[PDB]
């Protein structure tokens, strides 16, 4: 599994800040927009993109405050990410897109899709944010930890002072061992402790046991939209998963219209790190089927 990141940096001004993105593949056709989550960057897509770039433009931004994007003194609420990603998409002049989305990137993508349904041609998603009705529906092995993340004093000590989301949670979200080179690529945006704000605000935004109520409502709304939409859907899942257990993947594969589900084998949260070639290959092939009328 490749450890390099052989993509030239592209930058665009967005709301007075600068955002970094990968941009490879042909200039024409429908672009494929790849959205990462917490605590990753476009690096998480590095072994997926080469499967898609022969046929499609691939655009993979770093969320504001993450990767090579700027780090303004924000709270990095989900609202902030929404504002910056909306502006990012307009700054590149994107019209119609296919979305490839993960974790908080899926919350961004689905919320954008709900508001711009005529511009989304397809959605490939994995380990995505859905409402978690009670803590029992959060995986046991991760319960204590995320409950601690969702406090001000203890959670900030863990995530900001001790960098636990990078040094601990991240490798615990991959079944295979991450190498030192991979770990250094994930560490790079957060070497300065004060820059770790997004890593702490994100788990505090997760829609768990009804809180925070604003995020729960927004996530329910885009899941309702997703259930009503005929847009082509491709769902990757692994065993045991984290956000999406196999039973829920099986349920969604039937409840969501026009949904193809693909089992990647053993996987936790960063499915891209455990089976990039299957995920990349299946996305490339599915993209081709979007042009077959049937
Ligand atoms: C968008 C969703 C992304 C999800 C990707 C999920 O990955 C699965 C996440 O499970 C694994 C999460 N992290 C670790 O184990 C790191 C190691 N670690 C520590 O050092 C520590 C040190 C001091 C106190 C504590 C503590 N407080 N009371 N025990 C509770 C937990 C830990 C801890 C603790 O855990
Ligand atoms: Cl999170």
Author numbering: 4 to 297
Question: Anything the authors wrote about it?
Answer:
To overcome the issues of current PL and photo-crosslinking techniques, we here introduce a new method that can perform a photo-crosslinking reaction with proximal proteins using a visible light-activable chemical ligand (Spotlight) in a live cell. For this reason, we utilized the HaloTag system to efficiently deliver AzNP to the POI. HaloTag is an engineered tag protein that can covalently capture the haloalkane ligand within a few minutes in live cells with high efficiency. Since protein-ligand binding interactions and various “in-cell chemical reactions,” including the strain-promoted click reaction and photo–activation reactions, have been successfully realized with HaloTag, we expected HaloTag to be a suitable platform for our proximity photo-crosslinking system using an AzNP-conjugated ligand.
Among the photo-crosslinkable handles, naphthyl azide-based 4-azido-N-ethyl-1,8-naphthalimide (AzNP) attracted our interest for the following reasons: (1) it is highly stable in aqueous solutions, and has been widely used in hydrogen sulfide sensors;17,18 (2) it emits strong green fluorescence, which has been used in the fluorogenic imaging of alkyne-modified biomolecules in live mammalian cells; and (3) it shows good photo-crosslinking ability: upon UV illumination, AzNP can convert to the aryl nitrene species, which can covalently attach to proteins. To test this model, we synthesized AzNP-conjugated HaloTag ligands (VL1 and VL2) with two linker sizes (see ESI†). VL1 showed fairly strong absorbance in the visible light range (λmax = 375 nm, extinction coefficient value = 2230 M−1 cm−1; Fig. S3†). In this model system, VL1 successfully generated the photo-crosslinked product of FKBP25-HaloTag and EGFP-FRB that appeared around 120 kDa only in the presence of rapamycin and in the blue LED light illumination condition. In this reaction on the FKBP25-HaloTag, VL1 containing the PEG1 linker showed stronger crosslinking efficiency with EGFP-FRB compared with that of VL2 containing the PEG2 linker. Notably, we used an ambient blue LED household lamp (∼0.057 W cm−2) for all of our photo-crosslinking experiments in test tubes and live cells with VL1, which highlights the sensitivity of AzNP and the requirement of only low-intensity visible light illumination. We tested the specificity of AzNP-containing HaloTag ligands (VL1) to the HaloTag protein and whether it captures the local PPI network in various subcellular compartments in live cells. Since VL1 emits green fluorescence (λmax = 540 nm, Fig. S3†) and its fluorescence is increased after the photo-crosslinking reaction, we expected that targeting of VL1 and formation of POI-HaloTag could be readily tracked in real time in live cells, whereas other UV-crosslinking ligands (e.g., phenyl azide, diazirine) would not be visualized with microscope imaging due to their negligible fluorescence emission.
